[PDB]
């Protein structure tokens, strides 16, 4: 018995994604490769955001990712900022940005 | 005392793949789980709408690829499509 995630080489669960797609009432039928593709895309997005979050955490001399690191990662990357534009991260704060005219 | 499915272990596996040394807090893990669920809902809804528009009764890899192309910005979408097609090719090869 070999899991579908192992066959596809991914870390996210293909079977769980298939169950969620079936039970989510999205279509009458769900294709075989759709959960694999969706798991791959989810894993890639998680990898990107976690890489940026870890870079922020290292820049902050911290080993564990806190929500502030995730917020800094999302807002500093233009593509992730566009993807998560209408999203508020709890205990995330804001980017340090003081306008030039206000400076002495 | 009841099962509550979550992406905690999978997110941790991906984090260890990317950063073997860094860690994650409970609030941060909840945020990551919410992000994964939100992206899943977005892609699934876009795929369902795409299937409905073309009068198709199934969600295939093409529908999710188009959904990813529609949702994600340029480089993110391109790299995500590359990763997804690599995964699907490997899955078909493994049978």
């Amino acid at each position: 018995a070999k899991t579908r995630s192992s066959r596809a080489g991914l870390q996210f669960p293909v079977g769980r994604v298939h169950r969620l797609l079936r039970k989510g009432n999205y279509a009458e039928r769900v294709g075989a490769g759709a959960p694999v593709y969706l798991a791959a895309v989810l894993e890639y997005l998680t990898a990107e955001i976690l890489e940026l979050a870890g870079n922020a955490a290292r820049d902050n001399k911290k080993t564990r990712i806190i929500p502030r690191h995730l917020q800094l990662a999302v807002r500093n990357d233009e593509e992730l900022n566009k993807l998560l534009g209408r999203v508020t991260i709890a205990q995330g704060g804001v980017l340090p940005n003081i306008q030039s005219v206000l400076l002495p | 005392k009841t099962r509550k499915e979550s992406y905690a272990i999978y997110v941790y596996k991906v984090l260890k793949q990317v950063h073997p040394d860094t860690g994650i807090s409970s609030k941060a893990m909840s945020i990551m789980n919410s992000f994964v669920n939100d992206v899943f809902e977005r892609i699934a809804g876009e795929a369902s709408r795409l299937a409905h528009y073309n009068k198709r009764s199934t969600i295939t890899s093409r529908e999710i690829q188009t959904a990813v192309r529609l949702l994600l910005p340029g480089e993110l979408a391109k790299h995500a499509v590359s990763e997804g097609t690599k995964a699907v090719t490997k899955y078909t090869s493994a049978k």
Partner: peptide, 8 residues
Amino acid sequence: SRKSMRQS
């Protein structure tokens, strides 16, 4: 162990 080509 994992690197993304988006950050080159």
